[PDB]
Design a protein around this nucleic acid. Sequence first.
DNA 1: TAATTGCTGACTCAGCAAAT
DNA 2: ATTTGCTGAGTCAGCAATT
Lengths: 94, 97
Amino acid sequence: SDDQLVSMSVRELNRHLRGFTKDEVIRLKQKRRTLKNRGYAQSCRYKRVQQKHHLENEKTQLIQQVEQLKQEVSRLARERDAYKVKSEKLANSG
Amino acid sequence: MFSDDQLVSMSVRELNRHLRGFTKDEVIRLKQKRRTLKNRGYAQSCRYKRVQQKHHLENEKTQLIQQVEQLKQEVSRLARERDAYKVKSEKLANSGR
DNA sequence: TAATTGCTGACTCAGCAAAT
DNA sequence: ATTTGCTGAGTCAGCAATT
Ligand SMILES: [Mg+2]
């Protein structure tokens, strides 16, 4: 209360609450519920920020992948053109 | 009742004019109500904008994934055209020209 | 030498479903 | 099942920029 109450367990809890005032059995469970909800919000906020960075990282790595392929296209264009000229210049061999 | 929509569009100068003569613990209550209503809208913008930034990022990823596919196609296209023009050249070299 | 605006991390609650 | 976990909407506090 409030730190051994969230960390405490489903049975262990009911062991510590066996003869408890039946209106304070409800109050303590309400209290713990609320404290956990606070921790869920903390995860939810956290998960959101992690997904956001993950999405932006994916965007970055697609951008640099495009860049790689841009470099290859230009190499291959040149290599093809080296042969196309070579090919055409032989064909005028006459 | 007292429609919120109007209370938030008002100026704090215009509001004071309205409670020209007015109770104290209700004046303080009413200005704080106004703020709460504004904070509600501020929260919505925050929420709405970030889902929209998420969707925009998701589209951007989609647009880029496409360009990669197109580039990959072009890559194998050029490599094959290189090969074809090379094979044609070596054959022409064989005949001797 | 005030008070208001807009933003945002954090909390609380409702309701929804799955794991326990 | 109960409790758990998650998430959108609201509320508040407190910060800086604005008037
Ligand atoms: Mg029941």
